[PDB]
């Protein structure tokens, strides 16, 4: 009596029953709306007018008023998720007549003629039947079993009222155990012209597998098999935390688990629950938890837990505050013993979440969703293009790989936005040039994608997870001794952890790279990342410095936690000659605090086995003796200027584009004359020599020796023997 | 908990106002409220649990009436136990924050209630808090909370004992580990607390669920039980939060390692 809102529940007892028009609503509500039992009922689900015209019936006086049942077929057709709010309404005009109907054979190769066996009678024998959406189980179809479903979205009938979402009609068939101009034609999927909300499948998300299988296991073990875990007596966890940069797709995980799960779920509206009355929010939360526990399979979804649950230490806002945190933890600690209940909470930043929620008592299980790497970006672009299809755009694998390589610091949302505004750029180009031609002819190419990266205005530039592009050995021309040394250093831990454990030697976990400001000490990290195939943490020196006091400590602790959590890896520092000096040069107390924290983290009380830390510096004396202590950063590499062979290889690679035979240079006398330079200096010399070659008559097929020698006058090495002697003296004392 | 409640006449002979409040303070996750449950279960006396901010209402006098009633039925029956939890929000520091509304007036009423009619009686109040200085010094007085109980981070021996206890309760039909493995785990778990150890056990069980499913193709867990391989992982992925403490029991080495 006097109803306000309704909730959904699948029709039990399976089989057939009604399967379309169950509608087990309490008779009081039926008499309240003055609706004929032998007439259609309409439920709107808070919006989306059309109100889902479906016939109704009466219950057995046991079904409570709040909950209603409207069949799994309609549940899947309308993308109805168990827990959404539903609102009833008066029925509209009667549906006239159905014209064509046509099956689609979803997720299958069709060819059902052998297994057809007159499915038309079974499909259209049901009462009601709103044509564009039906979905039924495979049931039993002769031999072979298997699972088959069809798509019935396509239609050609016209309806005067545009209010109705799926424009149902009337069915009049003739059969036993005559149609309308057959139904079987083509294997089309859901038609786009109806703009229906399609369900989200796990195939939509790409490049996020490694944690998505873990999340699937963690959400399936409490629900599907609660008794197996409860037999141990430790009880299954109830809280799963999803964290990461914005746009990674936590909302996607929430939506896809809501869609793929046949059990009831409960979602929150966030700030909407917050009200002026202190007790109103408490009562709403208690009612939500009571509803969740009443239905034995339940799942709780929380959006923006940080806003709902801010930190007490950071801000004492008052009113709606950690009181709700205390009541939530009290309710969720002893809501049930075994049950099957899992709570999923997604936060933008984990640090701002109060430590009460971030305790193993409630949210021990955590899921880390970082920014996509090159492989994940390639996977999402390959998946992203598939949705558009080859008809809408001609893109090959090489273009996808090039885009993934170019797009380094881009979030998943940024990629989809780039695709959308690439389509926009295509529309403007077509309208401007072809004078309103069909948009399918121009389709999508790389020309608009280039301008897309040009004007995308990215938002993920500032991050501590910068990964340099993969660079192979052939690019780097250096000394074989240093390469052998670093190969041994990287090969010791990965395939000798057991040997270290048996012997007790462990690993030095510290390598110092000091040398002239030339080359071979920065791109060697990229070469190492390419060769080893292990994720690297390319963290620049000055970027960790922040105006706010303690922000650098937060960043370094977060990066250490990520390195520990991201398997045995290697962390590379671009420069350390700026943070390390505290006594030689005047520095703030923040720098000293950060240095002390780094010293305590590297080998202070806590020793890390899997991770390996390598430090590169441009000036060695800036590292204090506290950091330059035996047991840490013991290895020292001179990594001086490149030798004759290294410079020759660099020059050969630089001149590979040009023609050496036409120029007549043997690539040896140039290296003999270019001995005091560096690899980067050689690259710049070749660049300016090519510029001098091309400024004469635009494009040229070769660079001449006269241009080489003129550029040799033009440029200077800029390196003095005094700094080399100083580096040698430092190497002697080490 | 025994001497005041069970034998109040021994103190009433002295007649010097026996203590009523017992302070249970320490790091979070040390096992406080679960230990309190044991004191409630093993005692046949009445108990009373205060939800804290849930009891707090918008009306100024509603909380006063409800809590005065709570005390009325507490003292109506002679054998009674009083449990107070999350006193930090219940009794914030007056000087730290002058929030108003529900404020130190509640604290003053509690003081004048517990110090008002209790001469000998038989009444005990259990106080549980995370960081003691959040409770105002008025309650942290020999007049109100003279009794202090120190609960801290477990050491090597306590961690070994609790691990042996959890595994013993869990039974050996589900795991195979000897005393030296437990000792090694306790030594490795330098900075963890009992909640962290329970999380380690649960994550080790989960690691088994992941490994057991994805590898042996839905093989029986029994013929799989619990090893240290998954356990060793669990402690890596537990993401410790009990690293930052002033108290630190750094490792031990015998005289054999002493070179001097
Ligand atoms: N052969 C090469 N071709 C192109 N770039 C190079 C080559 N060798 C080195 N570089 C670049 O020059 C940079 C050298 O950095 P470097 O000046 O040593 O750092 P710092 O200023 O801290 O000393 C590296 O980042 C690398 O990318």
Beta bridge partners of A42: A53, A89
| E-only strand ranges, A495-598 | 510-514, 536-539, 570-573
Of B251, B210, B237, B23, nearest to A607 (Cα)?
B251
Atom of ligand 1 nearest to the CA of A521: 18
A278 and B58 within 8 Å at the Cβ level: the answer is yes
Q: How far is the CA of A518 from the centre of ligand 1 (A)?
A: 6
**What are the strands of the beta sheet with A88-89, ordered from one edge?**
A53-55, A40-43, A88-89
Would you say A222 is a known binding-site residue? no
Measured over all CA atoms, what is the biggest interatomic distance in chain A, rounded to whole angstroms?
A: 102
DSSP state of A6: B
Would you say B100 is a known binding-site residue? no
Experimental method: cryo-EM
Beta bridge partners of A300: A266, A343
Rounded to 10 deg, the angle between the A551-565 and A589-603 helix axes is 20
How far is CA A561 from its chain centroid? 20
- How far is Cα A564 from Cα A560, in angstroms, rounded to an integer? 6
**A277 contact residues in B (CB cutoff 8 A):** 58
H-helix or E-strand spanning residue A330? helix A322-333
Of A239, A291, A234, nearest to A264 (Cα)?
A291
Buried b (16+ CB within 10 A) or exposed e, A454-465: eebeeebeeeeb
Query: Å from B76 to nearest chain A CA?
Result: 28
Residue in chain A lying closest to B130 (CA)? A356
B241 and A355 within 8 Å at the Cβ level: the answer is yes
Compute the CA torsion angle A99, A104, A110, A111 (nearest 10 deg): 10
Q: Is B4 strand, coil or helix?
A: helix
Task: Return all residues near A128 (Cβ < 8 A) that are at least 6 apart.
Answer: A20, A21, A40, A54, A55, A168
Q: Which burial class, exposed, middle or buried, applies to B218 when counting CB atoms under 10 A from its CB (0-12, 13-18, 19+)?
A: exposed
- How far is Cα A51 from Cα A35, in angstroms, rounded to an integer? 15
Atom of ligand 1 nearest to the CA of A515: 23
Q: Is residue A171 within 8 Å of A160, Cβ to Cβ?
A: no
How far is CA A183 from its chain centroid? 41
Q: Is residue A282 within 8 Å of B56, Cβ to Cβ?
A: no
Region for A30 from its dihedrals, namely left if φ exceeds 0, alpha if ψ lies in -120 to 50, beta otherwise? alpha
Q: What is the DSSP string of A568-608?
A: S-EEEES--TTTS-SSSS---HHHHHHHHHHHHHHHSS---
Give phi and psi for A240, each to the nearest 5.
-115, 125
Beta pairing, strands A88-89 & A40-43: antiparallel
Of B242, B52, B107, nearest to A326 (Cα)?
B52
Q: Is A154 strand, coil or helix?
A: coil
Length of chain B as a residue count = 260
**B99 contact residues in A (CB cutoff 8 A):** 316, 318
Q: Is A223 strand, coil or helix?
A: helix
Q: Is residue A326 within 8 Å of B53, Cβ to Cβ?
A: yes
A234 and B29 within 8 Å at the Cβ level: the answer is no
Query: Å from B195 to nearest chain A CA?
Result: 7
- How far is Cα A127 from Cα A20, in angstroms, rounded to an integer? 7
- How far is Cα A509 from Cα A223, in angstroms, rounded to an integer? 43
Of A91, A362, A369, nearest to A238 (Cα)?
A362
Residue in chain A lying closest to B170 (CA)? A232
DSSP state of A469: P
Q: Is B183 strand, coil or helix?
A: helix
- How far is Cα A369 from Cα A466, in angstroms, rounded to an integer? 15
Quick one: CA dihedral A327, A332, A337, A341, positive or negative?
positive
Q: What is the DSSP string of A476-527?
A: ----HHHHHHHHHHHHHHHTTHHHHHHHS-----EEEEE--SSSSSSHHHHH
Length of chain A as a residue count = 734
User: Which B positions 109-168 lie with beta carbon below 8 A of chain A?
Assistant: none
Q: Is residue A254 within 8 Å of A346, Cβ to Cβ?
A: yes
Q: HSE on the CB side for B57, CA within 13 Å?
A: 11
Q: Is A303 strand, coil or helix?
A: strand
Q: Is residue A16 within 8 Å of A92, Cβ to Cβ?
A: no
Whether the CB of A683 sits within 6 Å of ligand 1: yes
Beta bridge partners of B48: B82
How far is CA A161 from its chain centroid? 41
Q: Is residue B242 within 8 Å of A358, Cβ to Cβ?
A: no
Q: Which of A217, A234, A277 sits opposite B205 (nearest CB)?
A: A234
- How far is Cα A609 from Cα A499, in angstroms, rounded to an integer? 13
Q: Which of B56, B170, B199 sits opposite A233 (nearest CB)?
A: B170
- How far is Cα B118 from Cα A47, in angstroms, rounded to an integer? 62
- How far is Cα A379 from Cα A373, in angstroms, rounded to an integer? 10
Of B69, B59, B216, B88, nearest to A316 (Cα)?
B88
Whether the CB of A719 sits within 6 Å of ligand 1: no
Of A37, A42, A45, A69, nearest to A53 (Cα)?
A42
Q: Is residue A243 within 8 Å of A349, Cβ to Cβ?
A: yes
Give phi and psi for A538, each to the nearest 5.
-80, 95
Q: How far is the CA of A724 from the centre of ligand 1 (A)?
A: 18
Beta bridge partners of A538: A572
H-helix or E-strand spanning residue A265? strand A264-267
Give phi and psi for A522, each to the nearest 5.
-120, -50
Query: Å from A276 to nearest chain B CA?
Result: 11
- How far is Cα A517 from Cα A723, in angstroms, rounded to an integer? 10
**B248 contact residues in A (CB cutoff 8 A):** 605
Query: Å from A503 to nearest chain B CA?
Result: 16
C-beta atoms surrounding A568 within 10 Å: 15
How far is CA A287 from its chain centroid? 34
Angle A347-A351-A357 from CA coordinates, rounded to 5°: 70
Q: How far is the CA of A603 from the centre of ligand 1 (A)?
A: 30
Q: What is the DSSP string of A385-444?
A: HHHH-TTT----HHHHHHHHHH--S--HHHHHHHHHHHHHHHHHHHHHHHSS--HHHH--
Atom of ligand 1 nearest to the CA of A526: 27
Q: How far is the CA of A521 from the centre of ligand 1 (A)?
A: 8
Terminal alpha carbon distance of chain B:
51
Of B94, B99, B103, nearest to B140 (Cα)?
B94
- How far is Cα B207 from Cα A380, in angstroms, rounded to an integer? 29
Of A213, A182, A210, A201, nearest to A252 (Cα)?
A201
Angle A505-A511-A515 from CA coordinates, rounded to 5°: 155
Q: Which of A217, A326, A564 sits opposite B53 (nearest CB)?
A: A326
Judged by a CB distance cut-off of 8 A, whether residue A321 touches chain B is no
- How far is Cα A140 from Cα A146, in angstroms, rounded to an integer? 9
- How far is Cα A585 from Cα A595, in angstroms, rounded to an integer? 14
Q: Is residue A29 within 8 Å of A110, Cβ to Cβ?
A: no
Judged by a CB distance cut-off of 8 A, whether residue B238 touches chain A is yes
Q: Is A164 strand, coil or helix?
A: coil
- How far is Cα B182 from Cα B185, in angstroms, rounded to an integer? 5
- How far is Cα A452 from Cα A574, in angstroms, rounded to an integer? 30
Of A219, A232, A428, nearest to A342 (Cα)?
A219
Would you say A206 is a known binding-site residue? no
How far is CA A613 from its chain centroid? 27
How far is CA B58 from its chain centroid? 30
Judged by a CB distance cut-off of 8 A, whether residue B172 touches chain A is no
**A565 contact residues in B (CB cutoff 8 A):** 237, 239
Rounded to 10 deg, the angle between the B194-216 and B156-170 helix axes is 50
Q: Is residue A512 within 8 Å of A635, Cβ to Cβ?
A: yes
Q: Is residue A564 within 8 Å of A575, Cβ to Cβ?
A: no
Query: Å from A625 to nearest chain B CA?
Result: 24
Radius of gyration of chain B (CA): 24
User: Which A positions 176-215 lie with beta carbon below 8 A of chain B?
Assistant: 213-214
Give phi and psi for B229, each to the nearest 5.
-55, -60
Q: Which burial class, exposed, middle or buried, applies to A501 when counting CB atoms under 10 A from its CB (0-12, 13-18, 19+)?
A: exposed
**B51 contact residues in A (CB cutoff 8 A):** 327, 330
Q: Is residue A82 within 8 Å of A263, Cβ to Cβ?
A: yes
Q: In chain A, helix, strand, coil percent, each to 5?
A: 40, 10, 50
Of A445, A440, A390, A397, nearest to A422 (Cα)?
A445
Interface probe with B: pick from A230, A276, A321, A364, most Cβ of B within 10 Å: A364
C-beta atoms surrounding A614 within 10 Å: 23
Query: Å from B79 to nearest chain A CA?
Result: 27
**A368 contact residues in B (CB cutoff 8 A):** none
Whether the CB of A679 sits within 6 Å of ligand 1: yes
**A228 contact residues in B (CB cutoff 8 A):** 221
**B236 contact residues in A (CB cutoff 8 A):** 564
Q: What is the DSSP string of A84-151?
A: --B-EE---SPP----------BTS----TTT-SSHHHHHHSSSS--TT---------SSS----B--
Q: HSE on the CB side for A631, CA within 13 Å?
A: 12
Atom of ligand 1 nearest to the CA of A517: 23
Rounded to 10 deg, the angle between the A374-388 and A412-434 helix axes is 40
A229 and B54 within 8 Å at the Cβ level: the answer is no
Measured over all CA atoms, what is the biggest interatomic distance in chain B, rounded to whole angstroms?
A: 72
Would you say A114 is a known binding-site residue? no
Beta bridge partners of A341: A298
Would you say B30 is a known binding-site residue? yes
Beta pairing, strands B147-150 & B46-49: unpaired
Terminal alpha carbon distance of chain A:
87
Residue in chain A lying closest to B86 (CA)? A326
Ligand 1: residue of A470, A512, A523, A654 to mutate (most ligand atoms within 8 A of CB) is A523
Whether the CB of A641 sits within 6 Å of ligand 1: no
Ligand 1: residue of A512, A522, A619, A655 to mutate (most ligand atoms within 8 A of CB) is A522
Nearest CA residue ID for atom 9, ligand 1: A519
H-helix or E-strand spanning residue A344? strand A340-347
Angle A309-A315-A318 from CA coordinates, rounded to 5°: 70
């Amino acid at each position: 009596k006097l109803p306000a809102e309704f909730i959904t529940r699948p029709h039990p007892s399976k089989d057939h029953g009604k399967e379309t028009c169950t509608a087990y609503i309490h008779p009081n509500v039926l008499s309240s709306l003055e609706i004929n039992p032998g007439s259609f009922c309409t439920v709107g689900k808070i919006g989306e007018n059309g109100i889902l015209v479906i016939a109704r019936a009466g219950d057995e006086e046991v079904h409570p008023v709040n909950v209603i049942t409207l069949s799994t077929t309609i549940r899947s057709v309308g993308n109805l998720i168990l827990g959404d709010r539903l609102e009833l309404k008066k029925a509209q005009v009667q549906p006239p007549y159905a014209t064509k109907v046509t099956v689609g054979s979803l997720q299958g190769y069709n060819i059902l003629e052998c297994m057809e066996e007159k499915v038309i009678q079974k499909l259209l024998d049901d009462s009601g039947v709103i044509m564009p959406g039906m979905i039924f189980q495979n049931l039993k179809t002769k031999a072979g079993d298997e699972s088959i479903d069809v798509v019935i979205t396509d239609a050609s009938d016209d309806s005067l009222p545009d209010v109705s979402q799926l424009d149902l009609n009337m069915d009049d068939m003739y059969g036993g155990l005559g149609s309308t101009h057959i139904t079987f034609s083509k294997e089309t999927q859901a038609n786009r012209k109806y703009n229906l909300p399609e369900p989200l499948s796990y195939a939509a998300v790409g490049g996020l597998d490694k944690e998505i299988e873990s999340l699937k296991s963690a959400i399936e073990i409490p629900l599907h098999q609660p008794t197996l875990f409860s037999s141990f007596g430790v009880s299954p966890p109830r809280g799963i935390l999803l964290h990461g940069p914005p746009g990674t797709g936590k909302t996607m995980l929430l939506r896809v688990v809501a869609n793929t799960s046949n059990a009831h779920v409960l979602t929150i509206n966030g700030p909407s629950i917050v009200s002026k009355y202190l007790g109103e929010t408490e009562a709403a939360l208690r009612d939500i938890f009571n509803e969740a526990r009443k239905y034995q399979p339940s799942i709780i979804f929380i959006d923006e837990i940080d806003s709902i649950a801010p930190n007490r230490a950071n801000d004492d806002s008052g009113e709606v505050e950690s009181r709700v945190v205390a009541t939530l933890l009290t309710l969720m600690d002893g809501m049930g013993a075994a049950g099957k209940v899992v709570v999923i909470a997604a936060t933008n930043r984990p640090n701002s979440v109060d430590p009460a929620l971030r305790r193993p008592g409630r949210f021990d299980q955590e899921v880390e969703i970082g920014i996509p790497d090159v492989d994940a970006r390639f996977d999402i672009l390959t998946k992203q293009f598939s949705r558009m299809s080859s008809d809408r755009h001609v893109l090959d694998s090489e273009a996808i790989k090039y885009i993934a390589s170019k797009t380094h610091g881009y979030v998943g949302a940024d990629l989809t936005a780039l695709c959308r505004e690439s389509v926009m750029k295509t529309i403007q180009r077509g309208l401007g040039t072809d004078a309103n031609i069909d948009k399918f002819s121009l389709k999508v190419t790389l020309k608009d994608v280039e301008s897309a990266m040009v004007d995308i205005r990215p938002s993920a530039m500032r991050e501590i997870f910068l990964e340099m592009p993969k660079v192979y050995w052939s690019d780097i021309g250096g000394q074989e001794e240093l390469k052998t040394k670093m190969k041994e250093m990287i090969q010791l831990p990965l395939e000798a952890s057991e040997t270290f454990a048996r012997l007790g030697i462990s690993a030095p976990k510290g390598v110092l790279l000091y040398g002239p400001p030339g080359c071979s000490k920065t791109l060697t990290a990229k070469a190492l990342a390419t060769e080893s195939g292990i994720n690297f943490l390319a963290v620049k020196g000055p970027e960790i410095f922040n105006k706010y006091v303690g922000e650098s400590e937060r960043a370094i602790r977060e990066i250490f936690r990520k390195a520990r959590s991201a398997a045995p890896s290697i962390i590379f520092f671009d420069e350390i000659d700026a943070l390390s000096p505290d006594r030689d040069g005047s520095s703030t107390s923040a720098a000293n605090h950060v240095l002390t924290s780094l010293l305590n983290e590297i080998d202070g009380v806590e020793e890390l086995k899997g991770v390996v830390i390598v430090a590169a510096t441009n000036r060695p004396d800036e590292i204090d003796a506290a950091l330059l202590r035996p047991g840490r950063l013991d290895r020292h590499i001179y990594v001086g200027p490149p030798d004759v062979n290294a410079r020759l290889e660099i020059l050969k690679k630089c001149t590979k584009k040009f023609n050496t035979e036409e120029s007549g240079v043997d690539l040896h006398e140039l290296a003999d004359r270019t001995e005091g330079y560096s690899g980067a200096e050689v690259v710049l010399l070749c660049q300016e020599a090519g510029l001098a070659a091309i400024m004469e008559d635009l494009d040229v097929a070769k660079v001449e020796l006269r241009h080489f020698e003129k550029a040799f006058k033009g440029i200077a090495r800029g390196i003095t023997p005094e700094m080399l002697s100083y580096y040698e003296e430092f190497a002697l004392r080490s």
